[PDB]
A paper describes a structure:
In this work, we show that a single point mutation in the porin PorB from Neisseria meningitidis, the causative agent of bacterial meningitis, can strongly affect the binding and permeation of beta-lactam antibiotics.
As a result of manual model building and interactive refinement, G103K PorB has a final Rwork/Rfree value of 21.3%/26.0% for data refined to 2.76 Å. The G103K single point mutation, located at the periplasmic side of loop L3, causes no significant changes in the secondary structure. The electron density around K103 was solved clearly from the α- to the δ‑carbon atom, whereas the density of its positively charged ε-amino group could not be determined due to the potentially high mobility of the side chain. Our experimental and computational electrophysiological data demonstrate that the conductance of G103K PorB is lower than that of the wt protein. Ampicillin transport is substantially reduced for the mutant compared to wt PorB in these experiments, demonstrating the effect of the single mutation on overall antibiotic uptake.
Numbering used by the authors:
A (entry chain X), B (entry chain X), C (entry chain X): 1 to 341
C-alpha cells in the first residue's frame, strides 16, 4: 500500500544587509527585517508493490507545501516512478541531481528562501537542482555505493525537440559514496558540454533573460568526515568551471570558482550545537580574477529535540561577499520549529 | 499520526441583479443567472505528537479545493505549525484572523463566491481574512477564552524588508469569548496604525491598484445570543473606522461604518429552518455621510441532515445596496448539498 | 471513510515529424526527438457515506499530478459531489462528458501529451472533455445502462450570467450502453445549438483567440465488439457536424467529418499484444471537401503485466495527416511503465 509523509518547518528570521551601493543610510546600513518564514515545508505520497522475483515497483509524489500558502504544484519536489531489485535502483522523473543528494553531508541548516545564502551554505548549494531525468543507484558494495544520472537534450530544451538549432543541453550527473565505521567520503559531479548560467553562477533554463551561454560546464564536489558516536564533522571541496559561449570577443574564454565548506556538531543528549564555516575563493570570470564572487560565511546554531520528529531550531549567520567598496555583509539570526511526519 | 479531513459542498444558485446604471432592460432588470457553483470545498491534513511533559506539537495544511477545478495552491486556507500545552496554544502560519473565527456565530450560510454577498452575510464578513502571523489562544477559564494575533511589518510588506520607505502595515488582532449554560458572547477586533482599503471597504495588500491608504484602521465586532436546546439565536454589532492617508486635500479626514446582523434558527429533528437579517448603516466617507455603502439584506433557508456529515441546503436572499437612483437590488436562491469527511 | 487512489505512468518517447512546409532538411525530415514524458499521472481522493434508506453520498477530488512536476490545481480531473441509490446516480461537478467515458472502449494507449495524436487515437478523442455539469447515470437494466448530462449556459459562459449578449453555449450529453455475454455496444453523443471550435476541430471556450463560432454542433459516437475470454476487439464510428456562425459570407455554411477506429488485442498470459487502426475521412469545411483534416493512423504495441497494478508498456505509431504537398507524417515509439494504486 501507500505512505503519506512530509516535513513542516517555519520560524522567525531577523536579517540586516550592509551594502554601500543600494543603501542610503550612513555606514551603508539597511534596517532590521523581522519576518515569519516557512523553511520549505513539504508533503509527499509514496508507495511500492513487490513484483515477486525479488523486485519492487516504486513511486513518489512530493510537493513544496509552505504553511504561508505561497506554493502550488504537484510533483515539484523529487517525484518519480522506478524499479528496485538485486541490481539496484532505476528511477525516471523530477529527480534530485546526484549533487543535490550530497547536500545532507554539506548543508543541514533550515532557512527561509530570503536567508538561504546567510543562514545556510546556500552559495555552495547553488549547483544543486532537480532535473527531469533517468537515474541509476547501485546497491551498497561493502560500504561503496554509486549513482549515474542523465538529462536528455529534448528534456533540457522542449522548444527544440525537432529543430536542433540550439546546441544540446543534455547533462550527465554521477556520484560515488563510501560509508564505513561511520566514516564517509563521496564524490559528486555533473557535466554538460553546453549549458547556461545566471549572474549568481546558478544554472538557468535555455532562453531565460540575461542568461550567459557556456560550454564544457562541469561541477566537482568532494565531502568527508563522519557522522556517529554523539558527534558529526564534515569538510567539502567544490570546483566549478566552464568556457564562455556567447559570440562576441569573450567567447571561448574561461570561467571557474572554488568553494570550501566545514561543519562540526556535537550532541549533548537532546541539544546538538553546530558550527559551519564556508569560503568562496577568488573567481576567474572570462579568464580574469574577479573578487565580486569571493565570500566568507560562518553559521553557529543548535537543535533541541523535543522528540525524534520535533525539533526547535536556533542559528545565526554572518556573510561577507566580494571585496572593496562594492561589499555586501549580511547578518541574520533565527528561532524555529520543525515537525517530520 | 496524521488525519485527513475536508468538506465538499456545491449546488445550483439562481441570481438576478437590478441595477439602474449597468442594465439596458426596462426596470433596470438583469436576466436570471442559473449556475452550478462550488461553495468552497476544502481538503486538509493535520497531525500532532505528544512531547511528553503535557505538551503537543500541532500542524495543519488546509487548501481550497473546488470540485469545479478552479483552485490551485497548498496552504491557502488556515495552515500552521504550533505548540499546545497547559499554558494554551501558540501557532505561526497562514492563520485565520481572530475576526474570521468569529464568522461561525455570525454567518453560517453556504454560498458560491458570486453570491457570498446576497446568499450570505458577505458584506459584514468583508473584514474577515487570513494573514501570515503568530497567534496565541488562551485555555478556557470557567467559560472565558481569549486570543491575540500579530502580523509583522515585513510579513505585511515583503518588498520593504530592508527599506522602510512605506509605513508599517503591522496589525494586531485580539478576541475574548465567553460560553456558559450554552450562552455565548464575544468581542473580536483588529488594529493597524497603517493599512489600505479597496472601494468595497475590504483591506487589500499594499501597492494594489486603486487602493486607498488609511491610518488608524480598526474593526470592532461583538456577538451574542446562544446555541443549544434544539435552538440557535445570535446578534452581532460591527464598527469599523479609519482616517484618509492619501496625500491630497482629503488626508486625515475620517471614514467609518456600522453594521448589525441578526440570525435565528430552530431545529425540527433533521430540518433546521434559519433566518438572518443584516443592516449596513449610513457610511461616513471623508467625514461625509455617503449612502452608497448602506444596505439591507435578509436570508431565509433550512438544512436537511441526511446524516451528521451530509446535509441538503436551501436558501433565498434579498439584498438592497445604497439609496436613490444608483441602487442595486440582488435576489438569489439556492439548493445544495454538503459532505464533511 | 475515505479512499486514496491514483495512477503513476511515464516513459521515454521517440518522435519524428516529416512536414514539407515547416522543415528545412531534404525530404522535409525533422530530427529525432528523444524525451522522458509523463503519460498523465493522476492522484485522487474519494469517499462515501450510507444515508440509511438504501442511499449513499459520493464525492471525488481527482487531479493531474505529472511526476515531471508540470501540473497544478485541485479538482482539474473528474471531481464531484453526488447521490446514489436504487434510482441510479446523480453527480454535479467537473464531470467527464459521456463521450469521454466512452474513451476506454476506443483509445486505451498511454502517451505523453506531445504524442497523444500519433501514439494514441488522439484525433478521434478531440471531442472528449470535462465540463462543469449535472449528470445522471441509470442503473443497469439487464445489460442496458444510460446517462444524461447538461452544461448550464452560465456555466458555459461566466462573463455573461446577467447579460445574454452572446448566444447560450449550454450543451446536452447523452449515452446508452449495452453489455451482455461480454458483448458491448454503446452510443455516445452531445449537442449544443451554439458552440465554438479551434482549427483542430476541438471545442474551445467562448472568447478564445482564433475560435470560430458554430451553431447546431453535434457529435455522434458508436462503439462495439467485445472484451472477455483472453481477447479484446472493438470498432467505433464517429460523426461530427455544425454550421458556420461567424458573420461574413460563410455563415450558415456546413461543416462535418467522419472518423472510424478499430482495435484488437489478445492476451498471452501476462503479455497483451494490441493493434489499432484509425481513419479520418475527407472533411467538408464550409460545405467544401477539405483534405487537410483526412488522416490514416496505425498503432501496434503490447503490455507486460508484472502484477495487476504494474505494467510495462511498448508501442509504435504511424500517422499521416491531409493530402498532397502540405502533408504531415508522424512516427513515434515508446517504452514505459505504469502503476495503479
Amino acid at each position: 500500500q501507500v505512505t503519506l509523509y512530509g516535513t513542516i518547518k517555519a520560524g522567525v528570521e531577523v536579517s540586516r544587509v550592509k551594502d554601500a551601493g543600494t543603501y542610503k543610510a550612513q555606514g551603508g546600513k539597511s534596517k532590521t527585517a523581522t519576518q515569519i518564514a516557512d523553511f520549505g515545508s513539504k508533503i509527499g505520497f509514496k508507495g511500492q508493490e513487490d513484483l515477486g522475483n525479488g523486485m519492487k515497483a516504486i513511486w513518489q509524489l512530493e510537493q513544496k507545501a509552505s504553511i504561508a500558502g505561497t506554493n502550488s504544484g504537484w510533483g515539484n519536489r523529487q517525484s518519480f516512478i522506478g524499479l528496485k531489485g538485486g541490481f539496484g535502483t532505476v528511477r525516471a522523473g523530477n529527480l534530485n541531481t546526484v549533487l543535490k543528494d550530497s547536500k545532507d553531508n554539506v548543508n543541514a541548516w533550515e532557512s527561509g528562501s530570503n536567508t538561504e545564502d546567510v543562514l545556510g551554505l546556500g552559495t555552495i548549494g547553488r549547483v544543486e537542482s532537480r532535473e527531469i531525468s533517468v537515474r541509476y543507484d547501485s546497491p551498497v558494495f561493502a560500504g561503496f555505493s554509486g549513482s549515474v544520472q542523465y538529462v536528455p537534450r529534448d528534456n533540457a530544451n522542449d522548444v527544440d525537440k525537432y529543430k536542433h538549432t540550439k546546441s544540446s543541453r543534455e547533462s550527465y550527473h554521477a556520484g560515488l559514496k563510501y560509508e564505513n565505521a561511520g566514516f564517509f567520503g563521496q564524490y559528486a559531479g555533473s557535466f554538460a558540454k553546453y549549458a547556461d548560467l545566471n549572474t549568481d553562477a546558478e544554472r538557468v533554463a535555455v532562453n531565460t533573460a540575461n542568461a550567459h551561454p557556456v560550454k564544457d560546464y562541469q561541477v566537482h564536489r568532494v565531502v568527508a568526515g563522519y557522522d556517529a558516536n554523539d558527534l558529526y564533522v564534515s569538510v567539502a571541496g567544490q570546483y566549478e568551471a566552464a568556457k564562455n559561449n556567447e559570440v562576441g570577443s569573450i567567447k571561448g574564454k574561461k570561467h571557474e570558482q572554488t568553494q570550501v565548506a566545514a561543519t562540526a556538531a556535537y550532541r549533548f543528549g537532546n541539544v546538538t550545537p553546530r558550527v559551519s564555516y564556508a569560503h568562496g575563493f577568488k573567481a576567474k570570470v572570462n579568464g580574469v580574477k574577479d573578487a565580486n564572487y569571493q565570500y566568507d560565511q560562518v553559521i553557529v546554531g543548535a537543535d533541541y529535540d523535543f522528540s525524534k520528529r520535533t525539533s526547535a531550531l536556533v542559528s545565526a549567520g554572518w556573510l561577507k561577499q566580494g571585496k572593496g567598496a562594492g561589499k555586501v555583509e549580511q547578518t541574520a539570526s533565527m528561532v524555529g520549529l520543525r515537525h517530520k511526519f
